[PDB]
Amino acid sequence: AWPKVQPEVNIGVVGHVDHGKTTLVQAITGIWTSKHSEELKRGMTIKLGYAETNIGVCESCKKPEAYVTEPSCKSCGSDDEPKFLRRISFIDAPGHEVLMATMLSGAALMDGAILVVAANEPFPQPQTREHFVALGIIGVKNLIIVQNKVDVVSKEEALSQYRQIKQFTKGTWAENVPIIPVSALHKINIDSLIEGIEEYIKTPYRDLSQKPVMLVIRSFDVNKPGTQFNELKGGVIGGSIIQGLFKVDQEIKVLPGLRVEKQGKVSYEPIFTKISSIRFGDEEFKEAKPGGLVAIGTYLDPSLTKADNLLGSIITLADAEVPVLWNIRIKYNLLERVVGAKEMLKVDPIRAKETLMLSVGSSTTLGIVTSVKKDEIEVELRRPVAVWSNNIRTVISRQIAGRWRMIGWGLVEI
């Protein structure tokens, strides 16, 4: 039989609103991550979507139909059992132009990504643009482009967009990114996408010796498939492990942590706890590693782990030395253009005293610019951030025409 292991790789699913990201995830995994009624009433889904699947291959059958997402070779007409390859998970990021912060939060978790392009819309739409550039800034360059909704366009219409997409990727880091046509709604050519995932999003090397760090995704910020148990021993803290491994009973801390307000002054103090359980889906494990959304069961009271007063951005081992900073210095670069705007706009230079939005790990922090000198800015944050390394790239956004627009990036200097 197929083993029950954690997912070993996170694949983002990005692209413009209504291009079919959530449907594509369902096509691969059988899971519909969002709530249809809420998406109807709000006109968008604001939470990250999450789903997992096994990947196998029917060694008797031919490609790409030999690739399967279940332990059956029926789809290629064989009764042999498929060879298990790996378990993978998907981060379904929002496309709506007001949700760039949530996309950037999800992009911190991706080992690769799929950019979904609708074939019946003019390429490239503003968030096709903005998400593509965001992926390149952040370093998620194991990319597959998917031309979705081919069922509604002619052969000539798909070919014509295909040429637009090749012209767009030409002369960029994505110049050799494959372009796979599919219908997510009717599950057309999904096996070729699976074949592409195996070829172009190989599981990354994990140095399991590094200090364990998990980026936190608050439960109210993500839609995950249904759970059998909500852990009894205390509140659960979910997220994705970006380095090292965590083990049951290890002492850990949640950073920045709990808001404490005493004699006027405000601080965020670390919340120490201990790993009571480790879950992926509804499977229990003794350890957790990078790849997948893990549920870390603690002994904390659920009223703390779900509190808004808890600034839970990362989890580390209890003895890790992690600065928690209200003021940070960023070595920054700006984009030439505001790629995600509808109008053609140049990015203005960073002015002192303006408000910026900083994406660090999975967290989102507003800040004021106290100092601009050359290519370094100094920012006084509204809430501190936990800088777990000296190597951390933040993404910078500015409010433009009543939306948060990605305008550049930087290195957080400590």
Ligand X SMILES: Nc1nc2c(ncn2[C@@H]2O[C@H](COP(=O)(O)OP(=O)(O)O)[C@@H](O)[C@H]2O)c(=O)[nH]1
**CB distance 258 to 226 below 8 Å:** no
Residues touching ligand X, count (CB under 6 A): 15
* 356 known member of a binding site: no
Candidate segments 77-85, 145-153, 242-250, 340-348, binder of ligand X by CB under 6 A: 145-153
Annotated binding residue at 367? no
> Is 80 part of any known ligand binding site?
no
User: Per the annotation, does 233 bind a ligand?
Assistant: no
Does 128 bind ligand X (CB under 6 A)? Our answer is no
Closer Cβ to Na ion, 60 or 160, answer by number: 160
- Shortest spacing between CB 34 and ligand X, in angstroms: 7
267 annotated as a binding-site residue:
no
Least separation in angstroms between residue 164's CB and ligand X is: 19
Q: CB-wise, 2 or 162, nearer to Na ion?
A: 162
Chosen residue from 184, 217, 311, 386 binding ligand X by CB under 6 A = 184
Q: Was 16 annotated as part of a binding site? A: no
- Annotated ligand binding at 92? The verdict is no
Closest contact distance (angstroms) between CB of 46 and Mg ion is 10
* Residues between 112 and 151 with contacts to Na ion, criterion CB under 5 A: 150
The answer to the question of whether 19 is labelled as a binding residue is yes
Instruction: Give the count of residues interacting with Na ion (CB under 5 A).
Output: 2
Site string for ligand X, 6-25 (x = CB under 6 A): -----------xxxxxxx--
Q: Report d(CA 205, CA 188) in Å as an integer.
A: 32
- Quote the CA–CA distance of 267 and 300 in Å, as a whole number: 20
Residue nearest to Na ion (CB): 150
Span near ligand X by CB under 6 A; candidates 156-164, 179-187, 238-246, 309-317: 179-187
The residues in 9-48 that bind Mg ion, with binding defined as CB under 5 A, are 21-22
Size of the site for Mg ion (CB under 5 A): 2
Nearest to 411 by CA among 398, 384, 395, 392: 392
**Contacting Na ion within 145-184 (CB under 5 A):** 150, 153
Residue (of 314, 393, 371, 378) closest to 140 by Cα position: 393
Residue 9 annotated as binding site: no
For 384, phi and psi rounded to 5 degrees? -70, 165
Q: Any binding-site annotation on 22?
A: yes
Separation between Cα atoms, residue 397 and residue 388, nearest integer Å? 22
Closest residue by Cα to residue 197 from 404, 366, 388, 13:
13
**Site track for ligand X across 287-326, x = CB under 6 A:** ----------------------------------------
Rule CB under 6 A: choose which of 29, 161, 183, 362 binds ligand X: 183
- Bond into 71 cis (ω within 30): no
For 181-198, what is the HEC assignment?
ECECCCCECHHHHHHHHH
Q: Which does 223 bind (CB under 5 to 8 A by kind): Na ion, ligand X, Mg ion, none?
A: none
Is 96 known to sit in a ligand binding site?
A: no
**Residues in the site for Na ion, rule: CB under 5 A?**
150, 153
Binding site for Mg ion (CB under 5 A): 21-22
Return residues touching ligand X (CB under 6 A): 17-23, 95, 148-149, 151-152, 183-185
Mark the binding-site residues for GTP, compressed into ranges: 18-23, 148-151, 183-185
Instruction: Report the binding-site residues.
Output: 18-23, 43, 45, 58, 61, 73, 76, 148-151, 183-185
Q: Which residues are annotated as a binding site for Mg(2+)?
A: 18, 22, 43, 45
Binding residue ranges for Zn(2+)? 58, 61, 73, 76
